[PDB]
Symmetry: C2
Subunit: 143 residues, 2 copies
Amino acid sequence: VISEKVRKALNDQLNREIYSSYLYLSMATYFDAEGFKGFAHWMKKQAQEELTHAMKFYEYIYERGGRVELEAIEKPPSNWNGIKDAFEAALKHEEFVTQSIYNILELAFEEKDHATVSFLKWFVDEQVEEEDQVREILDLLEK
Amino acid sequence: VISEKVRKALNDQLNREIYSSYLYLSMATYFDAEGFKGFAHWMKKQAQEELTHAMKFYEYIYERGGRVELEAIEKPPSNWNGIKDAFEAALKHEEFVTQSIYNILELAFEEKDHATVSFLKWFVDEQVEEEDQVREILDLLEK
């Protein structure tokens, strides 16, 4: 009942959320190496959140009668130039994930897949809240 | 306080548990595609267990004053020739993970790293219980 085009787009995004989880876990390995246990805990929490996002995509794909194919996960960076540098990389990364989702929203609109449109709008709300949260952390730390 | 040799071996194993989680999630995608929701649920549970194993390795590495480096995760198989074929692949995979851990145990013994020896013995107990559990499932299903 979902086209292969939307199913591929949602599977691509599932794999994107897996990498996002893995990237935040990698930022935690850097924070934990530098002794920033609280920032590392923030990243581990975010890594878990991204994995719960991936599994929401997982179950939606199967609910719409499609299948999930897991792809290779690229090695993430493991070092940044300080706390602020890591969080700016997170913000840039989230902005990319927000763009990726809007492109699925656009495809869903073009195919009049109104169930996918309503499914994705939760993720648009969540990622803007995520982007705002990283911006608030960066603002808190400035200079 | 852990040698680089043991730290590398434990980091290698951390990444091995990440792939194990990802492989069990991949078996779930196959079971879920075939409508075997109960076997898929077994695999998703196992995938979570393997990820909790990886994070036990994560925190132990940092407790012993080392650092974690995350590596690329290879694409897992996504199809098997039936339920039994998938579970035999799981058993073979677990036996490989059990061998990998015994090789760390051996290295820890050679370096008289008695803290690593006691840390790993929990994983040897768990993976034998895991192997036995897959054997019990295969025996239950035979013919």
